[PDB]
Amino acid sequence: ALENDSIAYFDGHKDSVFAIAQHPLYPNIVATGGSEGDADDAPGKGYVLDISATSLNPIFEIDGHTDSINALTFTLPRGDFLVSGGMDGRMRVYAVSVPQNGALAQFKFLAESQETEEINWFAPCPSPDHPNTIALGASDGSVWVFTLDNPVQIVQSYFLHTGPCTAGAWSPDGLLLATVSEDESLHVYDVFGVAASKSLVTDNGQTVVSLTNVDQRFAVEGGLFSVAVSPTGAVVAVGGAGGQIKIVGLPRLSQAGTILASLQIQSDNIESLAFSPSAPILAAGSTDGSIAVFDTSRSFALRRHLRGAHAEDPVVKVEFVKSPPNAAMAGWLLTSCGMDGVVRRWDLRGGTAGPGTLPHMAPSGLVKEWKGHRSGQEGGGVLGFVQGETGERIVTVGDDAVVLVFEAG
């Protein structure tokens, strides 16, 4: 008799659902992908759902993965493609057509490739200058940038990390790509060569910032697991073992590699980092169950330490609502999910603020929670979510092989 706040669900996955992606123009279109079983020959499987529809029927199926789907993304700016990335290293590219008569979206397979042996993440490039460009990071530490137009061309392939590449994030202008590794390194790639023409690259010609375990003010023993770039592109934050966060300077493209701040409020891996798009704050989710919030214009002074945000289960993902219905809350509303099987939303306006960081206004500031997934101890936990522009509909993917739809309103 678990509480269940879902307004819809999808139970077509046979095992853990690792990945979710939302169409950038049509938030009702969502793709989910994961594992079909734990037997070592179990294949991967993906679905596309239309959430405008209690038990959802998919409008498309992603087949061809011989191992778990680890990553999914629609391309920016308009979702012309859908890409899936597997534990098998397979990258499958689909053309996406969304008829203007309101009929079902169509998906056509274009090509499969296998540049790496295992894909850890995708990130679409936000540059308006380079549409339909995507980056991925792999288990061999390599980072690949592709452009889709054989629709696939290679923009770059990087081999600087020596251990698994755990996360990547683009700068807002989409000219820089920051990636981190278990081997404790951070590299920020000059993907389209702009920084090099301005004489802003390191001696390896490829990055604007390269920091490794030999850099003593930087090295995070145990590795890095998360990365985020500030809305101005001025700094990158990296999160790692033992609750450590490092703030590093980026060059202005329109100084670099300096450690501007080191943070260690939390006690275990920083798995998720997010800069607020419009408030001077940085949120960090930890494996220890807490979320911490820092004031970016006050040397990252601590604003609030939300202990037990997800009890003592890992905080898996934090993400700011881009355009909440209450415009006064823009930049201050945070959504999080955890291995406790719960999704939560937080009002971050409170805490210890200071000059320039006041709003024009179990832990505090909880606005709402959504239950339905099993908890981690019962084979559940929320592995990811999307929430569109307004945060009014939340779609989750769970370790318990379920996809749930929640509503905020």
Residue numbers in the entry: 52 to 104, 127 to 222, 228 to 332, 366 to 472, 487 to 534
From the study:
In the case of Sqt1, we were able to decipher the mode of L10-N peptide binding by X-ray crystallography. These structural analyses showed that the C-terminal domain of Sqt1, which is preceded by a non-essential N-terminal extension of ∼50 amino acids, folds into an eight-bladed WD-repeat β-propeller. Moreover, the binding mode of the N-terminal residues of Rpl10 (L10-N) by the eight-bladed WD-repeat β-propeller of Sqt1, as revealed by X-ray crystallography, allows establishing a refined model for the final pre-60S maturation events that lead to the stable incorporation of Rpl10 and the release of Nmd3. Taken together, we propose that Sqt1 may protect Rpl10 from aggregation before and/or promote its incorporation into almost mature pre-60S subunits in the cytoplasm. We conclude that the β-propeller domains of Sqt1 and Rrb1, which harbour the essential function of these proteins, recognize the very N-terminal residues of Rpl10 and Rpl3.
To this end, we also performed in vitro binding assays with the orthologous proteins from the thermophilic, filamentous ascomycete Chaetomium thermophilum (ct), whose proteins often exhibit improved biochemical properties. Both ctSqt1 and ctSqt1.52C (deletion of amino acids 2–51), which fully complement the absence of Sqt1 in vivo, could be efficiently co-purified with ctRpl10 or its N-terminal 20 residues. As a first step towards the elucidation of the recognition mode of the N-terminal residues of Rpl10 by the predicted β-propeller domain of Sqt1 at the atomic level, we independently determined the crystal structure of ctSqt1 at 1.94 Å by molecular replacement and of ctSqt1.52C, lacking the dispensable N-terminal extension, at 1.5 Å resolution by single-anomalous dispersion (SAD) followed by molecular replacement using the ctSqt1.52C Se-Met structure as the search model. While the N-terminal extension could not be resolved, the crystal structures revealed that residues 52–533 of ctSqt1 form a typical eight-bladed WD-repeat β-propeller; thus, being composed of eight blades that each contain four β-strands and showing the characteristic ‘velcro' closure owing to the presence of the N-terminal β-strand as the outermost β-strand of the eighth blade. Sqt1 and ctSqt1 share a high degree of overall structural conservation and mainly differ in three ctSqt1-specific insertions located in the loops connecting β-strands 1c-1d, 5c-5d and 7c-7d. Analysis of the electrostatic properties revealed that both β-propeller structures notably contain a negatively charged top surface, whereas the bottom sides exhibit a charge-mixed surface.
